[model samples]
Target chain A: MRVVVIGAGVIGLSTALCIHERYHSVLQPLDIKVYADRFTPLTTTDVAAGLWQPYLSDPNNPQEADWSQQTFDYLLSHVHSPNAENLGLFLISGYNLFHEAIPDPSWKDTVLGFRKLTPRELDMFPDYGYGWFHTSLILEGKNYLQWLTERLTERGVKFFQRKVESFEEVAREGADVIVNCTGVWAGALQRDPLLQPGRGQIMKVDAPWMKHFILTHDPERGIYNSPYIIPGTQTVTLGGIFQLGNWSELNNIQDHNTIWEGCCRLEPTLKNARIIGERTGFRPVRPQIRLEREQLRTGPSNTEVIHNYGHGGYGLTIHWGCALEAAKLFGRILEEKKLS
Target chain B: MRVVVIGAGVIGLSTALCIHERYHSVLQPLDIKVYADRFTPLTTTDVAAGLWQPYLSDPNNPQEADWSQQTFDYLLSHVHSPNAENLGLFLISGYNLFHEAIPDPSWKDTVLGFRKLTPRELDMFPDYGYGWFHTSLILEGKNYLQWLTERLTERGVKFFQRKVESFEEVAREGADVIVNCTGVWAGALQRDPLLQPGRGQIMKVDAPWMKHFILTHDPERGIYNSPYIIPGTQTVTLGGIFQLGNWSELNNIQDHNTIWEGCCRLEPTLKNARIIGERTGFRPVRPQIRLEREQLRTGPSNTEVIHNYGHGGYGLTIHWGCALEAAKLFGRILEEKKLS
Candidate 1:
């Protein structure tokens, strides 16, 4: 049986990888290919700082914590691998600074060394009334995406660079299963009225001295004083803004200045850092991310299609969790076909 | 029979498409998949303005002209197709300006509306001694690459995201043939130390008023001011520098300023153009482009590999020609296999 995973961003690649890994034995000589138009650097994954903490995903949904925990566990499993450093998988303790006290996050148990900020540390940011330092996973997207691409290829998964315009295209391609991981494009591709764009902008700058990820917020005004600064092996990622309904793909100078000044406020040394590049991406947002399976018929042939998109900005954080779920659906679809 | 085409850049995709098109019947139910670590927007092809004219390729080599002319003719054939404009296959008149008088290029006849610049036009740029105006096919890489990807998928070709580490991996994957179009990486992939990098930088800007593609040369110095200005559907490409052995991928501020000033000198109106983005790429340069076939055995299994890389900056210009050559070689390999 042939499987076509649409979209080449984090979600699509992870789902394709999961499907191939979990079912290749049962479905021996499994033919799986990923079809996507935009790959890394072009996809939203490149714009991500890839801070492995959930943001912009539905917290109220019980499944959200479940998914985040699953991803965290999966990422942790590779932390000690020989290629861990090469894969950009590691942990860094950082402050989640808030102006007001709040309960610990539901997924805090998944983090390492989670604890309240020290009094001395709290004094560093007098404006923040509350803070916590937790060692969380950080998957540098540049390295991780490339690593996943290579891993998938070694696993015999085929990747086709194509923009899947519609579901009909997948049906016509004669795939037994199609996983739609189009992300932000899902709104338009499926004509999903509930789906919207959560636009973001980031700047990758050369600042090797910056070691810790920082997320600062003003609880009183519900505004962020500084965008998060996530350090990677090559460069530090400074970002961003979550403007709903914004579909602009061009970099905004004001956003850049805001990010720069904010980052400087956190680490004054960043003032001397060289600006590397700018990126802008739209997160596929909805009331809830869609991850389910469906059956559609085209010309008397039923094609199993799995909808796994609307990840918004937290795609990198929960990609593996959602992928595992999608893979399970694929297994069930195949099993049903066998029973029938 | 399964065939793996390693690399997803213009050359690799074209070669894969050619093999599938040419050999699907002889090797019926041919399974062709493209494996690559990087795709468009992260590839050398993405940085290309994709100007159809040949550059940085050997002129004395008979096959160079042969391959280029074939590509030109093939691109011309698609000019009036139903989705030609969408495919970014169209002809536009442009100037090949020079600071000194020179003989017309050998393949000048292949260009439409080819003619020497009139005395009055030459007088407009008194500093330059020679110029010519001719219609050249300009493939907008953004559209053309995406179009080819979709076309290949529609034709049943699969794309896999993977970095090919060695030829043994190809044999292990069970592909009867492997096309290595790894471009600049070929130096390390096959340990061909002769392959070198020709570094280039370009800017994509919004200059809608610019109507012509310009290629200028300096008489006193070997280096160029503004290499070329190729207009695309959405943006005008201002480029570039061909610095050999330079591997810095970061955008150089000096290079950007030089490109801006040089382009404004060509068309003063360009000063008002809005800068969209900057890109840097290393062209795979060699004494001669490699297009050959080799057989490798991995643990008693033999896999035929076709070499189709090292076209340098002219990869886009001669991709189809090289692809056709690869497909023909694949056919011969299959025929030989049948006889054996």
Candidate 2:
């Protein structure tokens, strides 16, 4: 099966890997190529700490929860691997503080030992009335993406440092299955109005002493709130600000200060932590993740395009499940081909 | 002679006007075309309050003072014209507060009623020790630029909304004399290593009640200090930040907040003033404004290129003088044509 994946983020890499690993036995994966504008350290996932907690994704969709569960188990399985630490998968426990009481998360049972915060434990934060304590995995994104690229290449998936402009470009390359996992850039493939970009700024600090994660929520703000402190392998990622419809790549000092001030309130010791660097990237957002086979009018009429994008902030968290779903969609495209 | 000027800012427009006005009787003002990627409302001068203050400019150079003198007189000439108010030129007075006692400016005598701040007036600002009060003029940049643009066209000078990539492009247009007044864009013409871009952000507010300008200067921070409030025809421009070599056109919240907080301190009433908008621009900063003739090898060897740019924050302040100087360069080019 000749497949072309358009993206180099976690989603594209994992989707390519899933398709290759599953379908190569049926037919030689001789021409599976992944094309991207950027890879590894420059992608959106590179800026992310790759926390397992799902946010900015639909909770109502039962399939989404199942994807999260599948992704959680896949990451958890790698916890005891010899190269797991180097690949940046680390078991981490975190507290979610809410400004107002809300119902437990739909995937509350999926995370290890998920439970509502006790009144005594809520004493730590004065602003919150309710919370959740859960254990999940954090994949230090940049390093892990590099590892994934190295492993994926070793697994016979050819990676090309090229930007696929249109579905026709992939089709012209004689790709039997074209996977559009270009994330935010996928908006240009064809107009999908549900897709949007939300600006996010994060400050990285070297604080080896910090082991736990902290995420706070406001009823009005939803899950994407300011000053979520997630610990990775080396540095702690301090994130905040979800400016919807903004596409500035510049690190906004206002967002920086907000993150600094808010994160310092959560952990005062962060004040003493040495600053590493700051980065800004837009989070590809949609109300629901789109995982389906696209029928095209352009780009070689019959060329199959399996779109698996709009994973939102849960990209790293649910990427494995999304890739598996995309692989199934690819299978469905082939099944349709058999029927035709 | 046909002349092609590349830019539409104050400097470029004035340069073209100078060439057309002076040499028109010498010839026909037949072909003086101004090419720019942007004009009027978008140029760097448009964001400026058009204050007649020599800042981020070479003060020690004799010709720079001469240029300022010429520009000052020219703007003052239009202050009482029939269309002066519409053109946005107004005779205004301002206070320049210094953090510490410094020597009086070399051109202190040039401004009307230039004098040391009275001891009682010094008491008004508790932090400042020495200051100067001067009566000069402010040209509300946007309206004035539009007026100048309209008047330039009326004077038979042509304006083209286009970007000139190289002197070669000017040569291809069959221009006898090519004027490079592209400001920051001139960096691409040839390798002039001294030229650099400094990022600046300013907030505009509708504070019609406030009449006077307050420019507070710190010795370490220099003239490009935050919260200098200069009143214009319709809006007041509050500016700060000089991030050298940074070229981002995004409104930084920190810079905005700094301007806001500091301006509020200067004029408490500004807190109630409605904010019109925020803008960011790159100040084409060079140690000394490069005004000279370049012996070019890239474009036509004898195409005769006159470079006029890097006036910096004083773009609106001394543009007429620089234009006159560039016109002189054009004359020099014509004289050299006779010699050759």
Candidate 3:
């Protein structure tokens, strides 16, 4: 089967990797090709700080919770594996600072070190009304993006650098199956008005002294600040700001000052560090992350397109789980083809 | 003249606009087209904080000083004009804090409000050995880029989305003259070895409360931090970091931390500001800015190629001056052809 993945970001790459690894046989594996206008580091994947916390999309969807759990377990397995270093998976402890006390986290059972902060610990951050401590996996996006690209290349997936204008173009390119992972651009590509940009900005710094991640949100102020300090081999990733419906990729200095102050309030040591770079990317947001299969008939022939995007900020958190489900759907379609 | 400008950056657009405005006639006017892969706010121009300070490329090149002065005067004229509000030009006073005393500024005569800090002012920043206060114009890049694009469109300069791979392809497209303003990519386009990237990172914020620009350089630590608080109509621009030879556009948290700490040290009020965005771009850096013209023979006839790039981080500082010189060079080329 010839499959074309229409994005080179984390979702598309993970889906392609999942399909290739799961369905390979002695006679034939899937012949896969990935097309994108931009590759790793340029894509939304690079913009991610790669925290595994479930910034759950659709607070009511139980399936979405399942996806997050799957990804959490998968990443946890890698953290314990011997190849964890190569996979860019590591366990990190952090606090989620909140302005109000809420019910227990829905992901309490899945993640490690999930507990409410002590009254004494809560006293440390007097500005916040409540806090929760959790140990989760941090996937270094730079390393993970590179690692996935290398693994995909080794698995014989051809990568092209052209933008897919329409589904018919992929059909003309002789793709039996097309996976749309085009993220924020899906609004235009798929004509789904529900899809919009949840703009996220991150600043990477060389502050190895920062040992823990910190997430904070002020509902009253309408500000979401995530200062996830992911310590890598050479540099640390400090971020971020989440602005809904903002399409601009340009950097705003106010965002920088807010992030710095918020992070410093949590960890004062970060006030003295060197900035390495600034990254801005729009999270492909929708009412819910779309993980569905569609059948299309064009000019007397049928082509299957599986949409696996709209993860928003939780893309890294649930990418693997969503990719697994997408792959299984593709498998069911292949089985139906055999019976037909 | 039928001309093709191969970039939509500040240099290319400014050059095109300058040429059109300077040589327009009732009988005959310049016909121009701009081709670029990306336009503002995606371009490097949008990433600029647009401060007027002269970050000299070469200490030995006297023409660079002249270029900087010309640009200063032109911007100052607009700052004094009634159209200043629309042009996104305004006067801002700030201090250049240095760890050690330095010689008088090269452009001291041209700029307004250039003076040595008093003993009381020097005592205020006791950490710095010396200080200089100056009032200079700040160009809000968002407004300026939009203003230029609108004006260019109004003046009838056609814009196209296409990457020019070679001069041969440009000649084949039937251009009487081609202006190369590809910035950092000029090394690849014009095959100039000296041209390279001086990577710069900046953070924007919604801190309208900031009143003045602050530039400080810690030479012993090899850190240059310019907390240029440019108060725009909507938000303020706080910058920045200058890294020579760094090419990655991804935001570095270390750079952010460094900038935040440096700026906060100079002014602690920024600790509570909201971050708006993070921007990264490479300033096309050469030993000196290139402003030259060449004649190329293509098939049946010849095409003139004027190279105007490699202004480094000084692109915005000397953009108009360089454009003026480039337009004059083109005029001289036209006059020589008429004589022949």
Distance (Å) between predicted and true CA of B59, model 3? 68
Clashing pairs in 2: none
Q: Please, what is the TM-score per model? A: 0.49, 0.49, 0.49
Q: Model 2 misses residue A27 by how many Å?
A: 0.6
Q: Write the per-residue lDDT of candidate 2 for residues B165-265, one digit (tens) a residue.
A: 78887787687778888997688877788788878889888754344577888757656765587876556788867788878888898888888988777
As a TM-score, model 1 comes out at 0.49
lDDT of 1 by residue, B1-340 (tens): 7888888888988888888777777676588888888987688988888778875223656788889999988887655354665666654556778876787777777765466776544543545668876667777666777888988999888887887788887788687888999999886668897788888899998754344677777744343334678877567889857778899998899988888888776655566667999999988887778999987866676788889888887888899999999988988998888831
Quote the RMSD, in angstroms, for model 2.
24.8
lDDT of 3 by residue, A133-237 (tens): 655677866678788999999999989998888998888768888999899998666699888888878778765423346677665544344554555434566
Task: Candidate 3: list runs displaced more than 4 Å.
Answer: A26-29, A56-58, A221-233, B1-340
Candidate 2: regions farther than 4 A off: A56-60, A299-301, B1-340
Docking class of 1: incorrect
Which CAPRI level is candidate 2?
A: incorrect
